[PDB]
Structure 1
Amino acid sequence: KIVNIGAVLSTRKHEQMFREAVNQANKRHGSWKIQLNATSVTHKPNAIQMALSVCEDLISSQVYAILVSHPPTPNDHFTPTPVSYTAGFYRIPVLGLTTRMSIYSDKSIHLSFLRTVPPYSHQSSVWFEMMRVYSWNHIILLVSDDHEGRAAQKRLETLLEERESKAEKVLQFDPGTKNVTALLMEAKELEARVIILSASEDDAATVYRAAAMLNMTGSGYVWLVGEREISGNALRYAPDGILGLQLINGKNESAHISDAVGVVAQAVHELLEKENITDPPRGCVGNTNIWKTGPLFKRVLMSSKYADGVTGRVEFNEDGDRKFANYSIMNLQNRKLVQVGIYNGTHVIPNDRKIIWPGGETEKPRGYQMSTRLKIVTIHQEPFVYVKPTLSDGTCKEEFTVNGDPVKKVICTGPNDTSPGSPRHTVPQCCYGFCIDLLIKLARTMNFTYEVHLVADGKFGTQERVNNSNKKEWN
């Protein structure tokens, strides 16, 4: 009967809040012999230890579930791995209270760890809602190469290819990139100015410097920002009008205490309705067997619904992250966040406070701006492209057709020694043929300019294998 439920905080007043919520749980819809005794542990000064209270004090008191905060500083590298995985020997479910590190969302290694606060990769889905409100097709993605970052990349690419929307670039980083300027000059090459960001704080702040440095901060350069970069100095070097995110009820953890105790209490009263309730092991000695009701814990927690939470409906994803937690979209304006976006989880509510787009006006910009400059490479095929040399001037001659008509000629940059493993020298060479006539017809009827090159390979190029004997690539 007696269910011991743990809590990892830094304080003990909110542990007493857990105790009073346990009293509420004994009062509310859950009754009555004796089924609960109180266990609640603060953070430890030695981050090596982290399991002394767990085995000696919690598992010895048979704790079924622990509710864990970040750290006693909550901002170092002490995001809570060790209590979770030392509970994860025998597949014991743990609810991270306010964690947003989506490393923990990885089910493959983090086995039984579910959250009341969803991480930023779920927020990736939120940006797709921006798509359907603001009609985009050309996308700039910027990812510091993280397991969080690559998992968010997976969610982004799935939700793109489900609606067949196609991003342009995903440039990749480490946490610590400062010579972003090469990748910034690559970023100057697009129709798109839609900037989606996922990195650390100082990464962001230096980028808000270098890109502003490029200039690259004009109207259209819209900064789509994860909330880690809405902290620290990423705040302090960003321009204004930037669309950022806020999860509603992310910090008031007393509401999380009330909601979590109600959820876990009625989850226990769902557990007690089942059969073959295995006994929780006291010792972390001699107990050489994983939980059997571990997956039954999971079937309780995934299938239980809690519409009556303080944060809204406490009902989860297929990640154990809450569905339809309320979202808001904010705008630094004179570096002061301004409410625009509101979501239940999906329902678009733009506030009457207008979006000054983070350069110029409130006009919805376009990541669509053509250049009318068409990079063409031309295959060495006569009569389609007669590839002859130019003059000594580097210029084409004055010749004629059989009809006495002056030939449409193209200076074409291309190699001299057009063979692999040769000194290839990009020389202007005259080009003649069908397609030049076609392109100048399209220049007249279509108003484009054309950037014509020769093939270094002299070939079309097929899918062939690069070394390791599996890399099928178009050549």
Structure 2
Amino acid sequence: PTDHLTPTPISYTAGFYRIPVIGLTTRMSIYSDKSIHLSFLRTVPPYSHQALVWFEMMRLFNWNHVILIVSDDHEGRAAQKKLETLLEEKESKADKVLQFEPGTKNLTALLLEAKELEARVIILSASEDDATAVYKSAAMLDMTGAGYVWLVGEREISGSALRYAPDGIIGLQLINGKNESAHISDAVAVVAQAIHELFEMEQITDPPRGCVGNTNIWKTGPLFKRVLMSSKYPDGVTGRIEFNEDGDRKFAQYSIMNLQNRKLVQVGIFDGSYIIQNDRKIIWPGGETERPQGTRLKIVTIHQEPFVYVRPTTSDGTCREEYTINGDPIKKVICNGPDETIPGRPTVPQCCYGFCVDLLIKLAREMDFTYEVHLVADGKFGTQERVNNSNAAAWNGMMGELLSGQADMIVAPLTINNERAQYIEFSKPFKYQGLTILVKKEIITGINDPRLRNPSDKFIYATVKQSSVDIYFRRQVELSTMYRHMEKHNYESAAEAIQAVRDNKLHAFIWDSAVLEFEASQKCDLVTTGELFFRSGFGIGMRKDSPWKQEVSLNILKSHENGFMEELDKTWVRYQECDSRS
């Protein structure tokens, strides 16, 4: 074989005159598009059609969740289209899809992205050389292990790829793919049947004599193609013969192959639309007598005082036995996050305990999932930013990690808004709260305060730039004038913002109540005033594509009805000392 699709020219050359071409050995997918090769028919199905098996395979074992790894070319993309089209009849299933470009020796990062996806079954299509790199990279991350499944194309099991191939893999081989001759006898048989069926028709014309002097197509040729595609003759040396719309063969038979003891064995054979199980024992990767099996959540947060607390683990020792005001020991978990304590900023191992953590573990007992949490590097939750061309970069902060996949799920005190909402799915609100203002009691009429409306350099009103409140100010046209006065003298973080009012540096502070009221209780030197405006709720972020959120909301509601939240707010909102001062 020289390069690939060495029978490319003929399909073009005959194609000019519409002379039908029949390939014996070209399993190549790029010939399936009628547009580019319109005369092309074959006695073998392309590599893309192999997906018919996988869907049937997927069908039997009941794994609806898989991952697809394809090379980037007409071949891989066609395979993806075919499988997805198969899935389209079902609710469309793009559990995940992963595209890599050919000739790339190191694929590690992409698989690192793959592990995060919950679905543990994998299917891949690539060239032999690429497949070597795929298995080579996959073995490094130990994705060849049990609990993971591999489904593959004929090319992948063969060649150098076979050498580096993982154990327990599932594989395919087309029958009589190597033999031209059987396909010869049969193809010619079909041609004969087609012709004899053809000459039954009239107004036939012989094909052009010689290339020279003929600029015109051959009117019969498409007809010859039409009969030939419909030409039956089910009895053949190769197996049943019928042709799909693309001229590709239908109802071909493949032999499933297994890697047992690092050698190829036939576990079963596939013929027609139904798989057949050979007597041989099933093998899965790693040790399984039978194991049809088909697990982690990376969680991200921000440092917000009421719903999250940060203390480092004492030396190696983990977490304090510190107890809630109601006698209970405080629960805690480990979180890796930004540290400003060192002059440089290392992502630092830390201990974090919170309302959201108790909620998360409550879910974790309720939900099949297991959790590992690290705080986002940026102190900000997230905001759209950076470069002008096209749309460039992405909103900085934990949200950005969610789209990036650095964390698959976000647990924090996040207000829920439409601008964000289009990008991601949002869990039903655990909490309901609205923005408000903190000012010291000890001697602001409304959300609309004439005092705000009458701004003063002398009377400050302070906020955090890139806080969602700022997004409210920028996005909203109606108050758009009022935004700028707030923009002046902004603070970077929550602690500093509360402190300014406490330090009396700033006369007023504006933030959502859930973070603020707890503090209002905490000091009572400071007070919240007016009516919660921008009334909103706090919820757990997930990608729209992830179905776990469907349970999450379903769980959130279940947690609301029993009063679990009420008791949790009751625990974490102290309420001890404060009152309406006047």
* Superposed counterparts of 1:19-168, under 5 Å: 74=1, 76-77=3-4, 79-164=6-91, 166-168=93-95
- The CA deviation string for residues 23-71 of structure 1, in whole angstroms up to 9 with x for no partner, is xxxxxxxxxxxxxxxxxxxxxxxxxxxxxxxxxxxxxxxxxxxxxxxxx
Q: Which residue, out of 238, 241, 246, partners 1:319?
A: 246
- CA distance in 2 between counterparts of 1:411 and 1:215 reads 25
Q: Which residue, out of 423, 427, 430, partners 1:474?
A: 423
Q: 1:302 to 1:139 in 2, by over 3 A?
A: same
Match for residue 10 of structure 1?
none
Which residue type is aligned with residue 451 of structure 1? V
Name the SS for the 1:171 alignment partner.
strand
Query: Residues 379 and 460 of structure 1 are in contact (CA less than 8 Å); yes or no, is this contact kept in structure 2?
Result: no
Structure 1: runs of 5+ lacking an equivalent: 1-73, 418-423
Which residue type is aligned with residue 63 of structure 2? W
TM-score (norm 1): 0.68
Match for residue 363 of structure 2?
442
Query: Residues 211 and 217 of structure 1 are in contact (CA less than 8 Å); yes or no, is this contact kept in structure 2?
Result: yes
- CA distance in 2 between counterparts of 1:425 and 1:256 reads 65
Identical-residue share of aligned pairs (%): 78
CA radius of gyration, larger in: 2
Query: Residues 21 and 39 of structure 2 are in contact (CA less than 8 Å); yes or no, is this contact kept in structure 1?
Result: yes
1:265 is the counterpart of 2:186: no
Name the SS for the 1:178 alignment partner.
coil
* Superposed counterparts of 1:48-447, under 5 Å: 74=1, 76-77=3-4, 79-164=6-91, 166-367=93-294, 370-371=295-296, 374-376=297-299, 435=356, 438-439=359-360, 441-443=362-364
Query: Residues 389 and 428 of structure 1 are in contact (CA less than 8 Å); yes or no, is this contact kept in structure 2?
Result: no
Name the SS for the 2:156 alignment partner.
helix
- CA distance in 2 between counterparts of 1:437 and 1:223 reads 37
- CA distance in 1 between counterparts of 2:325 and 2:77 reads 61
Name the SS for the 2:122 alignment partner.
strand
TM-score (norm 2): 0.56
| Count of aligned positions | 389
- CA distance in 1 between counterparts of 2:146 and 2:332 reads 40
Name the SS for the 2:64 alignment partner.
coil
Q: 1:184 to 1:416 in 2, by over 3 A?
A: closer
Q: CA deviation at 1:96?
A: 0.9
Q: CA deviation at 1:232?
A: 1.9
Which residue type is aligned with residue 423 of structure 2? W
Q: CA deviation at 1:266?
A: 1.4
Name the SS for the 2:240 alignment partner.
strand
Q: 1:381 to 1:105 in 2, by over 3 A?
A: same
Which residue type is aligned with residue 149 of structure 1? G
- CA distance in 2 between counterparts of 1:313 and 1:416 reads 68
- The CA deviation string for residues 355-406 of structure 1, in whole angstroms up to 9 with x for no partner, is 1213111222323xx33xx4445699998x58x9989x9x999999999999
Structure 2: runs of 5+ lacking an equivalent: 392-418, 425-582
Match for residue 451 of structure 1?
373
Q: 1:78 to 1:169 in 2, by over 3 A?
A: closer
Name the SS for the 1:308 alignment partner.
coil
- The CA deviation string for residues 139-175 of structure 1, in whole angstroms up to 9 with x for no partner, is 1322111111111111111112322263443322233
- The CA deviation string for residues 109-166 of structure 1, in whole angstroms up to 9 with x for no partner, is 1121010011110001211111122221331322111111111111111112322263
Name the SS for the 2:155 alignment partner.
helix
Query: Residues 195 and 222 of structure 1 are in contact (CA less than 8 Å); yes or no, is this contact kept in structure 2?
Result: yes
Query: Residues 390 and 397 of structure 1 are in contact (CA less than 8 Å); yes or no, is this contact kept in structure 2?
Result: no
- The CA deviation string for residues 312-358 of structure 1, in whole angstroms up to 9 with x for no partner, is 22111222222212221012333432112222222221111111213
- CA distance in 1 between counterparts of 2:140 and 2:354 reads 45
CA RMSD of aligned residues (A): 4.2
Which residue type is aligned with residue 56 of structure 2? E
- CA distance in 1 between counterparts of 2:267 and 2:333 reads 53
Query: Residues 377 and 455 of structure 1 are in contact (CA less than 8 Å); yes or no, is this contact kept in structure 2?
Result: no
- CA distance in 1 between counterparts of 2:283 and 2:8 reads 41
Q: CA deviation at 1:467?
A: 5.8
